[PDB]
């Protein structure tokens, strides 16, 4: 979120992210660990992060149920969140 | 001497008036829920120029007369030390 | 992006006139609105920190600034409003 | 302290004809019956 | 304890009344900071974000973390439980 | 190498039990061990038993009423009874 | 409205129109009480200042500390914006909650052209802030003689 | 604690950076100074650099800066770590009888689990998702 | 100097222990805090660990904890040494 | 102060009932004191060894023995929350109002530590609610300073 945004509004957005995984990705998402106030470095009232764990590959047959399509659908859905940048993404094969 | 001051007073005033203060925030955590405003409080910042150092207030006199740092000293940018002076073929230089 | 920050100027002259030390002013502002790590205590056998800070409801609004009093050398209680002025400005929440 | 927690070192040895492994197995048994919140570990020669 | 802090003696009034810390302050155990608040599948949580030391083996380090975690579990307060919301190592093991 | 037959055991306070409870747990374990002379011999503490110590309480109120500072009280007691390293001098060329 | 606050700050000239031409409140105020005019004034967006005043922006809007867009323009040395605001009736002697005037601000930052304009509009040179200071006291403390001579 | 981005940069970040010289195999250095009062300076080294020595060299320089830092910064503890930027894993902790709040769980983790994890070989850095308890004294300006 | 075991433990030992993180190849750590005013913390490393690297990593973590230690302890200094128990010889010096 | 005196001090502190029994049979001095003036009864009272307390009192222990700072076994029992030891000592003549050298009484100590039941027992046995230590404090002063509302009621 923009600086000046409150912890409270960051939580509202995190709740929306958590909601989407728990309801729209029921079949693919095992868990969501959401953190308010911590983001890809560092702290802040206006940042947060969700770690998502998928069900096992064997229960996610099809391109549409793999991380790429999942993160793309999520980012698209999250684009309709106001005054926030929310991005779902797969970590690259290699850091640098 | 004329103003009844010493380097101690000078040093004390510079520490007090050339300062960078951690001053906190409005609406910082933990907030009163419903808070809309989060903003850094900015108090004293380091001085940036001879003029600012010049007007450091050493004291006011009984008659409201003011004694400024520039009244007891020359203020100027100058070497941290003056020990090393270089020349290149007889012309003023610096180097590494 | 830059954001609104609350700029407070301590009036050196006025503090001297009232006999309020600059250190008392800055400690009062910092500890109250920023919090101060005082020292350690022992919680269930484990060393942990002790923090002083204003209770949330007193550091939420700009007008709260004047509800904080410093003690002058002559014993008199002096509100922040007597020796400071403030204005809004923009500043960066993250400098790279 | 041991590994950053309050501790008390206890020394001893297997009785004659007994292996240290046997002595240790028993110590562990005995230690399993101690008040809630009390753990144990092996250090030094026993750690190896 | 909060109780002991509560009775820190700030001053003795002129009439001989006492001013204790608890008279000018609320006293409680509370976080060093209040910026980070996590949830797991929507319920209150905490946790540890762990990063690999440069050049270390991911699989060995994960095993060492689990082994250390197993030493802690039998001493958990009732109801406390470890969950595993995000681990990059199973994929390595499983893909190999 | 210690001794073969020898073992080296650590009893650990895993839950903030404190010194006295750790001691009782230790004694409990030592009494049981002693019931197995067939397996265990000379099972004993490697450390030291508690001892009498002289607890002195400063009365904060009385010191404040008498106008005596705690710093003066505490360095007077510590310096005199425990000794205090003040600073260094130079003895025939060597700093001491 | 909130869109207008952002466009005015970013100096998005058209955008300000698209919104000014869809009836966004021209005096929308943010959390610190800044209007689009405060923002344009602060970030030196002259054209946007003019467009806003055209569409009836309150020229003497004040933030939660009593500060007006004139305070801002003058303080940051935006000479032309200062002229325009005054043209459009900016209270030249407006005081914020500190008793500080646009002239105090311009004098503090040594803006000479600006100081002139404010004077050429009836700025009270004797106006005192909450500490009893005038622009002249400022120019003196700062050791700014060009400015000092002017105020006399 | 309580410092804004600019105060952190000009009182800590610059001071440390100016002391970062004579370090082998340095490719580049970057830093962030933020209004949470936090600074992070990242020094990135040639592939094949010995991380142990890189860390030793950086800290030999940091130590020249330490005395020049604000006392409050020194008391928070400055740290020097050699780790990957990404998370290896997140260990989550919950309470299934719901008889401990988020704050209680975080304190339990801080007081009873985090230190041993942090000391485990191969563990480069550990972030607590929450905060350890402190004794909080919440002042009341009216009473004061 | 003058400190009892608990004072040593709670103001020095716990603080140092809490900073012994991010050091490579640690097997275990143990410590004694005693009423002679002394603390010894021993960190023991995997066989094959470079002892010099082990020592410098410990010494560097200590260095960063020094500001958390009492003044009188910072003043005495804290030694980080490699442990050995074998002397080549002991030379005695006596007066007859 | 004797072979058996020393052992009795140790055994009482460690709560070794059997050893104490044997020592009582053999004439171990119930009045042995260590350097700080603690008798086996002091030790037993401090460490909460009820059976040993009772055995000692049956074997002629001085229930009102005082240490070098004037503290009695009742002081210790009351301070460390040993309710039934406190009851036993009082049954056996313990001076409910004994003042140590600081003018501190068993009531002050129980109060300070919030031991309500012990406070009530003490009052039952005639504890002087108005007794003041060297600083003029009573158990009631202590309870309001501690912010212990309940104990403060009991002490009206
Ligand atoms: C092909 O790469 C990209 C392409 C398009 C957009 C992006 C990126 C991208 O790599 C990227 C990031 O790496 C990061 C972020 C990001 O938004 C993007 C993109 O939008 C967000 C971030 O900066 C934060 O705000 C954390 O709180 C964290 C993170 O920074 C990471 C890598 C950074 N460069 C930073 O220097 C540090 C290494 O952490
Ligand atoms: C050390 O690496 C990181 C460390 C911390 C945070 C980050 C990253 C990171 O690499 C990263 C990204 O690569 C990306 C993003 C990001 O937030 C981060 C980090 O936060 C977000 C992103 O979608 C945008 O912001 C676009 O505007 C772009 C991008 O997604 C990437 C991967 C996608 N699957 C896809 O390949 C896309 C094109 O680029
Ligand atoms: C006739 C030959 C058939 C296989 C012979 C292999 C012998 C020894 C193999 C060593 C490792 C085995 O690992 C092989 O793949 C994974 C391991 O994570 C196992 O099981 C796997 O099931 C599904 C998909 O099938 C995965 O999503 C899951 O993560 C994984 O657990 C397989 O049941 C096992 O056969």
From Swiss-Prot, chain B:
Coiled coil: none annotated. Disruption phenotype: Loss of susceptibility to contact-dependent growth inhibition (CDI); inhibiting cells still contact the target. Disulfide bonds: none annotated. Signal peptide: none annotated. It is found in: Cell inner membrane. Induction: Positively regulated by MarA, Rob and SoxS transcriptional regulators (at protein level). It comes from the Bacteria. AcrA-AcrB-AcrZ-TolC is a drug efflux protein complex with broad substrate specificity that uses the proton motive force to export substrates. Homotrimer, with large domains that extend into the periplasm, interacts with AcrA and TolC. AcrA may be required to stably link this protein and TolC. Interacts with AcrZ. Part of the AcrA-AcrB-AcrZ-TolC efflux pump. Belongs to the resistance-nodulation-cell division (RND) (TC 2.A.6) family. This is Multidrug efflux pump subunit AcrB. The lineage of its organism: Bacteria, Pseudomonadati, Pseudomonadota, Gammaproteobacteria, Enterobacterales. The gene is acrB.
UniProtKB/Swiss-Prot annotation, chain I:
Disruption phenotype: Loss of susceptibility to contact-dependent growth inhibition (CDI); inhibiting cells still contact the target. It is found in: Cell inner membrane. Induction: Positively regulated by MarA, Rob and SoxS transcriptional regulators (at protein level). AcrA-AcrB-AcrZ-TolC is a drug efflux protein complex with broad substrate specificity that uses the proton motive force to export substrates. (Microbial infection) Involved in contact-dependent growth inhibition (CDI), acts downstream of BamA, the receptor for CDI. Its role in CDI is independent of the AcrA-AcrB-TolC efflux pump complex. Belongs to the resistance-nodulation-cell division (RND) (TC 2.A.6) family. Homotrimer, with large domains that extend into the periplasm, interacts with AcrA and TolC. AcrA may be required to stably link this protein and TolC. Interacts with AcrZ. Part of the AcrA-AcrB-AcrZ-TolC efflux pump. This is Multidrug efflux pump subunit AcrB. It comes from Escherichia coli (strain K12). The lineage of its organism: Bacteria, Pseudomonadati, Pseudomonadota, Gammaproteobacteria, Enterobacterales. The chain holds residues 50 to 145 of 1049 of the full protein.
């Amino acid at each position: 979120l923009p600086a000046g945004a409150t912890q409270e509004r960051t939580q509202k957005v995190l709740n929306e992210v958590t909601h989407y995984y728990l309801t729209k990705e029921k079949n693919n998402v095992e868990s969501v660990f959401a953190v308010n106030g911590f983001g890809f470095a560092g702290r802040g009232q206006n940042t947060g992060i969700a770690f998502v764990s998928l069900k096992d590959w064997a229960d996610r047959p099809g391109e549409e149920n793999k991380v790429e399509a999942i993160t793309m659908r999520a980012t698209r859905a999250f684009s309709q969140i106001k005054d926030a940048m929310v991005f779902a993404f797969n970590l690259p094969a290699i850091v640098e | 001497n004329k103003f009844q001051l010493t380097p101690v007073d000078v040093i004390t005033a510079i520490k007090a008036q050339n300062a960078q203060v951690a001053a906190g925030q409005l609406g910082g955590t933990p907030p009163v829920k419903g808070q809309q405003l989060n903003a850094s409080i900015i108090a004293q910042t380091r001085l940036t120029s001879t003029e600012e150092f010049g007007k450091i207030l050493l004291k006011v006199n009984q008659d409201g007369s003011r004694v400024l740092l520039r009244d007891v000293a020359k203020i100027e940018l100058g070497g941290e030390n003056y020990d090393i002076i270089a020349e290149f073929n007889g012309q003023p230089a610096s180097g590494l | 992006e830059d954001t609104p920050q609350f700029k407070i100027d301590i009036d050196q002259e006025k503090a001297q006139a009232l006999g309020v030390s600059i250190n008392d002013i800055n400690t009062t502002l910092g500890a109250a609105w920023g919090g101060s790590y005082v020292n350690d205590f022992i919680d269930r056998g484990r060393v942990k920190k002790v923090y002083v800070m204003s209770e949330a409801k007193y550091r939420m609004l700009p007008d709260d600034i004047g509800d904080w009093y410093v003690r002058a050398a002559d014993g008199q209680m002096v509100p922040f409003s007597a020796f400071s002025s403030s204005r809004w400005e923009y500043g960066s929440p993250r400098l790279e | 302290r041991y590994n950053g927690l309050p501790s008390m070192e206890i020394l001893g040895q297997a009785a004659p004809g007994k292996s240290t492994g046997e002595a240790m197995e028993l110590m562990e048994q005995l230690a399993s019956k101690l008040p809630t919140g009390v753990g144990y570990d092996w250090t030094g020669m026993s750690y190896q | 304890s909060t109780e002991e802090f509560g009775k820190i003696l700030l001053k003795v009034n002129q009439d001989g009344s006492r001013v204790l810390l608890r008279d000018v302050a609320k006293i409680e155990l509370g976080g060093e900071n209040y910026d980070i608040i996590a949830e797991f599948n929507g319920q209150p949580a905490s946790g540890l974000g762990i990063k690999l030391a440069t050049g270390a083996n991911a699989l060995d380090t994960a095993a060492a973390i689990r082994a250390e975690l197993a030493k802690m579990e039998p001493f958990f307060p009732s109801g406390l439980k470890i969950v595993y919301p995000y681990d990059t190592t199973p994929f390595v093991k499983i893909s190999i | 190498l210690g001794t073969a037959t020898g073992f080296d055991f650590e009893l650990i306070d895993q839950a903030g039990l404190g010194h006295e409870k750790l001691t009782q747990a230790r004694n409990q374990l030592l009494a049981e061990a002693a019931k197995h002379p067939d397996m265990l011999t000379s099972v004993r503490p490697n450390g030291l038993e508690d001892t009498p110590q002289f607890k002195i309480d400063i009365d904060q109120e009385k010191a404040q009423a008498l106008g005596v500072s705690i710093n003066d009280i505490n360095t007077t007691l510590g310096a005199a009874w425990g000794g205090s390293y003040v600073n260094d001098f130079i003895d025939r060329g060597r700093v001491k | 409205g909130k869109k207008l606050l952002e466009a005015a700050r970013a100096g998005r000239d058209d955008e300000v129109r698209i919104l000014m031409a869809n009836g966004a409140d021209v005096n929308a105020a943010d959390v610190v009480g800044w209007t689009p005019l405060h923002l344009a004034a602060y970030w030196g967006h002259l054209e946007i200042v003019e467009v806003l005043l055209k569409n009836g922006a309150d020229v003497n809007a004040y933030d939660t500390l009593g500060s007006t867009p004139l305070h801002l323009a003058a303080h940051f040395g935006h000479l032309e914006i200062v002229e325009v605001l005054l043209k459009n009736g900016a209270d030249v002697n407006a005081k914020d909650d500190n008793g500080i005037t646009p002239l105090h601000l311009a004098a503090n930052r040594g803006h000479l052209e600006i100081v002139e304009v404010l004077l050429k509009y009836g700025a009270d040179v004797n106006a005192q802030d909450k500490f009893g200071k005038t622009a002249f006291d400022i120019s003196i403390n700062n050791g700014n003689e060009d400015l000092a001579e002017i105020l006399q | 604690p309580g410092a804004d981005a600019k105060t952190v940069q000009d009182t800590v970040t610059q001071v440390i950076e100016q002391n970062m010289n004579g370090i082998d195999n340095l490719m580049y250095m970057s830093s962030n100074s933020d209004s949470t009062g936090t600074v992070q300076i990242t020094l990135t080294f040639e592939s094949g650099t010995d991380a142990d020595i890189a860390q030793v060299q950086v800290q030999n320089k940091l130590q020249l800066a330490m005395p020049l830092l604000p006392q409050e910064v020194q008391q928070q503890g400055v740290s020097v770590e050699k780790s990957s930027s990404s998370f290896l894993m997140v260990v989550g902790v919950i309470n299934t009888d719901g008889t401990m709040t988020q704050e209680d769980i975080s304190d339990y983790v801080a007081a009873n689990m985090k230190d041993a994890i942090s000391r485990t070989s191969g563990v480069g850095d550990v972030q607590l998702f929450g905060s350890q308890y402190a004794m909080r004294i919440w002042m009341n300006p009216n009473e004061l």
